[PDB]
Amino acid sequence: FVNQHLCGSDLVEALYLVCGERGAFYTKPT
Amino acid sequence: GIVEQCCTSICSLYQLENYCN
């Protein structure tokens, strides 16, 4: 993770690996 | 309002942990 702008799958790419196996699913853009 | 900032400026990875529980 670095200091830059991120959104959509990037907001999770950031979480997805930081809280991996830590139950995330905080948003569902479907 | 969780990306209002990370989606405009920047955010610390450890701060992203706030969106897990």
Side-chain angles (χ1 to χ4, degrees):
Chain A
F1 212 50
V2 273
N3 282 260
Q4 54 144 275
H5 311 257
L6 58 304
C7 294
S9 321
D10 308 305
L11 306 152
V12 282
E13 164 124 333
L15 267 133
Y16 147 65
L17 20 70
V18 310
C19 287
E21 200 136 312
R22 227 96 155 133
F25 30 90
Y26 65 97
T27 37
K28 250 117 178 290
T30 63
Chain B
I2 175 280
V3 301
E4 44 155 336
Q5 24 162 1
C6 312
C7 256
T8 170
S9 40
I10 318 288
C11 279
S12 20
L13 177 160
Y14 20 94
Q15 94 98 224
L16 271 282
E17 149 149 63
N18 252 349
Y19 324 137
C20 313
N21 266 334

